[PDB]
DNA sequence: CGGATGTATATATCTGACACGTGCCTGGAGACTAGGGAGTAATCCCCTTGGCGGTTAAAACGCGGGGGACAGCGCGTACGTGCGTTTAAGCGGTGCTAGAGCTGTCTACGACCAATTGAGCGGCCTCGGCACCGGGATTCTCGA
DNA sequence: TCGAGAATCCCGGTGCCGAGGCCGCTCAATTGGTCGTAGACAGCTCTAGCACCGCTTAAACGCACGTACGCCTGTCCCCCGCGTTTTAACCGCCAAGGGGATTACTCCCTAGTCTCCAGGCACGTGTCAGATATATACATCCG
């Protein structure tokens, strides 16, 4: 009997292949769920999370603070033009509005 | 008391793997969990739609690879599909 | 009796409410307003505190977006002040009404 | 009743400032009172229906996040 | 190689409502698309709602709630009344 | 025998049940769900055809053209809210002239 | 001869093309545009005729809606002539880009 | 030149369906640009669906599904 | 309103999409079962409502005033339109080959269940990142 | 420009309570097989999207001429900023109850298999509703 080896480590992923596989099983998405589909979905999820977290961390470090809070995550989502298009409909609780001011409203 | 499920010890690993000296608050952790859940729902629903539309009954890696090229805008989709292919081809071996 | 020029307090106080995250509406007035509105559809209804905070924090971002669109429409008319007609125009172009 | 006026004129002022509005008219307050009432009715309608189907009498945060998700104004951080 | 349609089924309703009135094939295709669209709009909403409550059955109740959600007020009232009439005619028959 | 007839409907109940089974909406579908959904679909279709027939009578034509569908769906305050986003192919636009355009 | 006053010809045009159900755009130029834009992503894209017709219907409808919103914005500005800034306003509030 | 096939009178009548009185001369380039953007956005999704199908043709069903994703679903093609 | 035009209105003749037998097979409807999802029952306590009282920032009121929304003149300039013409778009055939679409294998792949156990969640301290603030150095601002 | 004044940032201090690390402790994720079957594949068909030539002609295009109106001058009024007076939000802490999560036990209702039968849609006929062209009043513009 081979020793237990988790499927996330088998593919070198930080999100679980098994849990995504179970969710696709019992989520009523298809009659049968493929084998590589869960690991592919886990890879996509972990890449997206890594990107949105890296941007938020950079923005927070710019703000001289170590903790990541919804403000610095709101800035990360609304700053990059690709995540803004991906999350156009989303509202973030306790997020605030990115600092902008119109040129016409400027003094004089 | 009956376990609820959350991607906490799962986003901690990614954050510590990308920023070894950064921490996340509970509220931002709740935002990240809801974002990952929403992306999962969107992509899985799109793959199910493709499977139903093409008169197929199983969502293989191809259906999720096609659905990503639709859901993810900009040059983000290219990196996402590249890393998905990398992960699946390493998993096959 | 130093008096700020009209507009100085407008270019100020606009920084405070943009850089910070807040609610900009008192808890209890909004709670009773929500109770009043919900009373019509069903009598004797109970709201979880989180279910009122979520409503408020999702209705703040709607008003903020509507006001931003109204401001843009008013700028189009070579003006600064925003009229109600700007608000009906914003809703009409948005397709909501 | 009459809590719609509870959303006070300084509240609309602060919201406009956060949005980026420099000068404020007089009737926009009443129009903001109207549009807020319409939007909250349109959300509470769905929230109460979702609660009623489940056969409970407490509106949870999840059953309001669902209603906002239906309208396309999805909210993160609750449920 | 067969395609399912709704031509006769819309035609019967038309004849019951307006006699001596005909439908061009384009309008029949439009009505078929409309029926197939509302069917999905209701069924998917009922499925998501049933799955949101740890339930695995779509009975008349989930669809009734879906009808109440997907329609405007004065139309939702009549639609729900029609649904209850049909079901009550059926539970007795 | 057709459940479509014991319930006194016009749309199928068998087709709706079969689609709900292979639509993969849930593992198990209720018994009154198909008849309820068929009744709702039939009511909406009857309303739409009634409006289209009224439009055809307005245009003095015995047949209903997609343009009649467009007029019927744009001329009502409640079915517009249900079909506001959608566009009828080969249809038209509601006759609309702004007030300031008039001399 | 008779020289129409500007505007009356425009309304004579409006009231006759409102009833129009036709497409207003020439089929071959639009089909060529669709083929050209398709060639960028992949080559040998054999377009079915019904697909081109559906795409034409969708594009026509979208442009009609955009010009309706643009007309609304232009009338707001105490103007009767369409300007590109009014199109930018419409495409900003609609949030398309 | 393929884009300039949609010429000034065609855009004028489209605007007339929009119900307008007077139209400026700078509208044409902006309209061509926005129609170009919308058409490429729809065609990318349609071609993606066709590539999923392992086919080399774009059927009307693919176009109506691509529009369905865009939130502008179209009746009258199946 | 004198005069003039593209505005509905009544008529003949297509004529081709719409309206109607049909049949047959193909999916729906009885017949019957059984096993697992759901309704009913109890309960209990976590969470919700209702309430008193001290505290004060926020709301309301009120007035000075100044900058902007608005009323108006004009002008020339960019946009209607009348018209020739000329340019390329639908019709309508021709040819035809590449690709969608429907069947027949049968095999590699996924559901399922029987052991097996470590990863992930519930719970418990705990110390330091950040909240709050005193106050000082610092930087806009507008009346001169 | 300039200088008193009004905000503002920040340096440093105290304080805290909530991420974070650690420790049980289940049960959902791993193996190991069978077992059926979805589709991967090959092949054959047939069909329509595509190419092209000419033809008729609808309208696209360029050149003008007229002119409607998009864009500084002055005005008055309404919204901002501050000073004073509330007053209801808020925070705390209490008390009481109710209904929302839990298990436990049926139990009955829909998935599943089978056999039968009628109805729904392609496959063929007619046929007549409305397009298409022709001649007659006219609402409104030129002026």
Selection from G11, B92, D79, C72 nearest residue H21 by Cα: G11
User: For residue E18, what are its two tokens?
Assistant: 């307006």
Strand partners, H51: none
Selection from E91, E84, E78 nearest residue E63 by Cα: E84
Mutation site, D8, D10, D13, D35, interface C, largest C CB count within 10 A: D35
DSSP E strands in chain H: the ranges are 22-23, 57-58, 74-75
Burial category of E50 from C-beta neighbours within 10 Å (exposed 0-12, middle 13-18, buried 19 and up): buried
Kindly report the CA angle at D15 between D11 and D20, in degrees rounded to 5? 145
Domain CATH for H5: 1.10.20.10
Selection from A70, A72, A52 nearest residue A60 by Cα: A72
Burial category of G85 from C-beta neighbours within 10 Å (exposed 0-12, middle 13-18, buried 19 and up): middle
Please name the residues between 36 and 95 in chain A that touch chain C, using a CB distance below 8 Å: 70-71, 74, 91, 93-95
For residue A4, give the nucleotide whose C1' atom is nearest its CA.
J30
Strand partners, B58: A32
- C23's torsion region: left (phi>0), alpha (psi -120 to 50) or beta? alpha
For every residue of F23-69, DSSP letters joined together read: TTS-SEE-SHHHHHHHHHHHHHHHHHHHHHHHHHHHTT-SEEPHHHH
* Cα G23 to chain centroid, rounded: 10
Cα separation of C37 and C40, whole Å? 6
Q: How many helices (H) and strands (E) does chain D have?
A: 3, 2
- Pick from C10, C60, C61: which is nearest to D22 by CB? C10
* Cα H74 to chain centroid, rounded: 13
- Please answer yes or no on whether A96 and C21 come within 8 Å at the CB atom: yes
Protein CA G6 to sugar C1' J141 (Å):
12
Distances (CA, A) of E32 to A76, B23, E90, H70: 45, 55, 26, 21
Task: Give A28 to chain E, closest Cα distance, Å.
Answer: 9
DSSP 8-state class, residue A85: H
Strand partners, D58: C46
Domain CATH for B82: 1.10.20.10
Burial category of G65 from C-beta neighbours within 10 Å (exposed 0-12, middle 13-18, buried 19 and up): middle
Selection from C47, H11, E34 nearest residue D58 by Cα: C47
Task: Give chain D's largest Cα–Cα span.
Answer: 48
- Do residues G78 and C77 lie in contact, with contact meaning Cβ atoms separated by under 8 Å? yes
How many CB pairs below 8 A link F and H? 24
Cα separation of F1 and E83, whole Å? 20
Cα separation of D73 and F91, whole Å? 31
Task: Give chain B's largest Cα–Cα span.
Answer: 49
Cα separation of E13 and E11, whole Å? 5
Q: What is the H or E stretch that residue B58 is in?
A: strand B58-59
- Do residues D34 and C79 lie in contact, with contact meaning Cβ atoms separated by under 8 Å? no
Protein CA F34 to sugar C1' I59 (Å):
57
Residues of D in contact with C34 (CB under 8 A): 40, 44
Helix A36-62 vs helix B76-92: crossing angle, to nearest 10: 130
Local structure of B24: helix, strand or coil: strand
User: For residue F50, what are its two tokens?
Assistant: 């009634």
In 3-state terms, chain F is what percent helix, strand and coil (to 5)? 55, 5, 40
Cα separation of E49 and E58, whole Å? 9
Residue with tokens 């086919």: H55
Dihedral over Cα of E87, E89, E92, F4: its sign: negative
Residue with tokens 């009548």: H13
Burial letters for H12-26: b for 16+ Cβ neighbours within 10 Å, e otherwise?
A: bbbbbbbbbbebeee
Selection from E4, E65, B51, E32 nearest residue F30 by Cα: E65
Discontinuities in chain F with C to N beyond 2.5 Å fall right after none
DSSP E strands in chain A: the ranges are 32-33, 67-68, 91-92
Which chain F residue has the Cα nearest residue A29?
F24
Burial category of C3 from C-beta neighbours within 10 Å (exposed 0-12, middle 13-18, buried 19 and up): exposed
Selection from G17, G23, G24, G14 nearest residue G53 by Cα: G23
Local structure of H61: helix, strand or coil: helix
User: For residue G95, what are its two tokens?
Assistant: 């949030």
A25-28 long-range contacts (CB < 8 A, ≥24 apart) are A27/B44, A27/E51, A28/E47, A28/E51, A28/F24, A28/F25, A28/F26, A28/F27
Burial letters for E63-89: b for 16+ Cβ neighbours within 10 Å, e otherwise?
A: bbbbbbbbbeeebbeebbebbeebbee
Kindly report the CA angle at B4 between B2 and B5, in degrees rounded to 5? 145
Cα separation of F67 and F59, whole Å? 11
Local structure of H21: helix, strand or coil: coil
First to last CA, chain E: 36
- Please answer yes or no on whether A40 and B88 come within 8 Å at the CB atom: yes
- Pick from C11, C19, C57: which is nearest to A99 by CB? C19
For residue A21, give the nucleotide whose C1' atom is nearest its CA.
J29
Number of folded domains that form chain D: 1
- Please answer yes or no on whether B63 and H65 come within 8 Å at the CB atom: no
Expressed as residue numbers, the domain containing E90 is 1-93
Report the 10 Å Cβ neighbour count for H6. Answer: 22
What are the φ and ψ backbone dihedral angles of H76, each rounded to 5 degrees? 115, 15
Asked whether residue G6, judged by its CB, lies under 7 Å from any atom of the DNA or RNA strand I, the reply is yes
DSSP 8-state class, residue C82: B
Protein CA F19 to sugar C1' I28 (Å):
13
What does DSSP say about strands A91-92 and D58-59: parallel, antiparallel, or unpaired? unpaired
Residue with tokens 């005619």: E89
Rg of the Cα atoms in chain D: 15
- Do residues A56 and A73 lie in contact, with contact meaning Cβ atoms separated by under 8 Å? yes
- Please answer yes or no on whether A66 and B58 come within 8 Å at the CB atom: no
Task: Give C3 to chain D, closest Cα distance, Å.
Answer: 18
Protein CA F10 to sugar C1' J126 (Å):
28
Residue with tokens 């001289």: A64
The answer to whether B62 contacts chain H (CB < 8 Å) is yes
Chains B and G touch (3+ CB pairs under 8 A): no
Discontinuities in chain B with C to N beyond 2.5 Å fall right after none
Task: Give F25 to chain A, closest Cα distance, Å.
Answer: 7
A57-62 long-range contacts (CB < 8 A, ≥24 apart) are A57/B15, A57/B18, A57/B19, A57/B22, A60/B22, A61/B22
Strand partners, C60: none
Q: How many helices (H) and strands (E) does chain H have?
A: 3, 3
Which chain D residue has the Cα nearest residue A107?
D22
For every residue of G66-92, DSSP letters joined together read: HHHHHHHHHHHTT--EE-HHHHHHHHH
Asked whether residue D22, judged by its CB, lies under 7 Å from any atom of the DNA or RNA strand I, the reply is no
Kindly report the CA angle at G81 between G78 and G83, in degrees rounded to 5? 100
DSSP 8-state class, residue E53: T
Cα separation of B49 and A90, whole Å? 22
Selection from E82, E61, E92 nearest residue F6 by Cα: E92
Q: What is the resolution of this structure in A?
A: 4.0
- Do residues C93 and G69 lie in contact, with contact meaning Cβ atoms separated by under 8 Å? yes
* Cα D33 to chain centroid, rounded: 11
What are the φ and ψ backbone dihedral angles of C46, each rounded to 5 degrees? -110, 135
Kindly report the CA angle at H74 between H68 and H78, in degrees rounded to 5? 95
CA atoms within 13 A on the CB side of F79: 21
What are the φ and ψ backbone dihedral angles of D16, each rounded to 5 degrees? -60, -40
Report the 10 Å Cβ neighbour count for A89. Answer: 11
Local structure of C21: helix, strand or coil: coil
Dihedral over Cα of E9, E11, E17, E23: its sign: positive
DSSP 8-state class, residue A87: T
Cα separation of G45 and H50, whole Å? 9
Asked whether residue G2, judged by its CB, lies under 7 Å from any atom of the DNA or RNA strand I, the reply is yes
Cα separation of B72 and E41, whole Å? 24
DSSP 8-state class, residue H47: H
Burial letters for B31-63: b for 16+ Cβ neighbours within 10 Å, e otherwise?
A: bbbbbbbebbeebbbbbbbbbbeeeeeebbbbb
Cα separation of C67 and C84, whole Å? 11
Expressed as residue numbers, the domain containing D63 is 1-78
Mutation site, D65, D68, D77, interface B, largest B CB count within 10 A: D77
Rg of the Cα atoms in chain F: 19
Expressed as residue numbers, the domain containing F21 is 1-103
Secondary structure string (H, E, C) spanning G2-62: CCCCCCHHHHHHHHHHCCCCCCCCCHHHHHHHHHHHHHHHCCCCEECHHHHHHHHHHHHHH
Cα separation of F34 and F16, whole Å? 6
Cα separation of B84 and G87, whole Å? 40
Number of folded domains that form chain E: 1
Cα separation of E85 and F6, whole Å? 13
Cα separation of C54 and C60, whole Å? 10
Residue with tokens 């669109």: C69
Chain E neighbours (≥3 Cβ pairs under 8 A) are A, D, F, H
Which chain C residue has the Cα nearest residue G76?
C77
Distances (CA, A) of F94 to C6, F50, G16: 47, 19, 12
What does DSSP say about strands D75-76 and A91-92: parallel, antiparallel, or unpaired? parallel
Asked whether residue E55, judged by its CB, lies under 7 Å from any atom of the DNA or RNA strand I, the reply is yes
Cα separation of F46 and F58, whole Å? 18
Asked whether residue G94, judged by its CB, lies under 7 Å from any atom of the DNA or RNA strand I, the reply is no
- Do residues G25 and H31 lie in contact, with contact meaning Cβ atoms separated by under 8 Å? no
Residues 6+ apart with CB under 8 A from F10: E9, E12, E13, E16, F4, F42
DSSP 8-state class, residue A35: S
- Do residues B15 and B22 lie in contact, with contact meaning Cβ atoms separated by under 8 Å? yes
- Do residues H60 and H77 lie in contact, with contact meaning Cβ atoms separated by under 8 Å? yes
- Pick from G17, G37, G83: which is nearest to H17 by CB? G17
H-type alpha helices, chain E: 7-17, 25-51, 60-70, 73-92
Local structure of A92: helix, strand or coil: strand
Distances (CA, A) of C90 to C60, C65, C80: 17, 10, 16
């Amino acid at each position: 009997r081979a020793k237990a080896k988790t499927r996330s480590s088998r593919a070198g992923l930080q999100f679980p292949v098994g849990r995504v596989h179970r969710l696709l099983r019992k989520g009523n998405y298809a009659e049968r769920v493929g084998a590589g589909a869960p690991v592919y979905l886990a890879a996509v999820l972990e890449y997206l999370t890594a990107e949105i977290l890296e941007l938020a961390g950079n923005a927070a470090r710019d703000n001289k603070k170590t903790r990541i809070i919804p403000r610095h995550l709101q800035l990360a989502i609304r700053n990059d033009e690709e995540l803004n298009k991906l999350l156009g409909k989303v509202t973030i609780a306790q997020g605030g509005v990115l600092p902008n001011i119109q040129a016409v409203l400027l003094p004089k | 008391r009956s376990r609820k499920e959350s991607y906490s010890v799962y986003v901690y690993k990614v954050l510590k793997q990308v920023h070894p000296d950064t921490g996340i608050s509970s509220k931002a952790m709740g935002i990240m969990n809801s974002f990952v859940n929403d992306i999962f729902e969107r992509i899985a629903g799109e793959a199910s739609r493709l499977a139903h539309y093409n008169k197929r009954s199983t969502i293989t890696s191809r259906e999720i690879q096609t659905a990503v090229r639709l859901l993810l805008p900009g040059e983000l989709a290219k990196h996402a599909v590249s890393e998905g292919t990398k992960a699946v081809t390493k998993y096959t071996s | 009796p130093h008096r700020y020029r009209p507009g100085t307090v407008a270019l100020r106080e606009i920084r405070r409410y943009q850089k910070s995250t807040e609610l900009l509406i008192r808890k209890l007035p909004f709670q009773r307003l929500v109770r009043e509105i919900a009373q019509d559809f069903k009598t004797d209804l109970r709201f979880q505190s989180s279910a009122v905070m979520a409503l408020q924090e999702a209705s703040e971002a709607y008003l903020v977006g509507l006001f931003e669109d109204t401001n843009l429409a008013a700028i189009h008319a070579k003006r600064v002040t925003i009229m109600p007609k700007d608000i009906q125009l914003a809703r009409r172009i948005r397709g909501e009404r | 009743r009459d809590n719609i006026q509870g959303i006070t004129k300084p509240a609309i002022r602060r919201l406009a400032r956060r949005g980026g509005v420099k000068r404020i008219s007089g009737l926009i307050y009443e129009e903001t009172r109207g549009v807020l009432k319409v939007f909250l009715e349109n959300v509470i309608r769905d929230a109460v229906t979702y609660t009623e189907h489940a056969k409970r009498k407490t509106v949870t945060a999840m059953d309001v996040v669902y209603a906002l998700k239906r309208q396309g104004r999805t909210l993160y951080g609750f449920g």
